[PDB]
Ligand binder design. Sequence first.
Ligand SMILES: [Zn+2]
Ligand SMILES: [Zn+2]
Ligand SMILES: [Zn+2]
Length: 178
Amino acid sequence: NSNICEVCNKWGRLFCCDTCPRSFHEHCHIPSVEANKNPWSCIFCRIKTIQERCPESQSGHQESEVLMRQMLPEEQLKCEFLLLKVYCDSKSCFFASEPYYNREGSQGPQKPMWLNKVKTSLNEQMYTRVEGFVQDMRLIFHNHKEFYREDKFTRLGIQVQDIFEKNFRNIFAIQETS
Ligand SMILES: [Zn+2]
Ligand SMILES: [Zn+2]
Ligand SMILES: [Zn+2]
């Protein structure tokens, strides 16, 4: 197995996957690495299994259909993996914890949002449809773009949103378009 966490790329107290060489810190994995379970299979492995059991799940889908899906166990897992893929980028640090807003010439957002809040929301089964999760994820980057206006720091929101959207299209097998 790898000797660094797949998500944050640091060493430490690592839990190893039994079916692939990835390793994880306890709270870097989503969901947090389960207490017992031998063997244990990481979320990458669990997502690959879904795909293998239903090859047709990789045919193209419309976003509108995906968003209306109820959060049954497989869609819960897919949103957890998508959230983890965002954390895998180091620029996610900017969006992880609760933000605050005091900048001359800007007003803070009406509905602040952040990754750790989405994480808690998923853990507490607060989303009933994929749309709930995706709306909160997109709001993180929209709030950032609106608040930082012409500051070049706005680009960090564009960058991390792009990681989100690419992974959303991959995980949920959104139909490719130009
Ligand atoms: Zn880690
Ligand atoms: Zn694995
Ligand atoms: Zn099948």
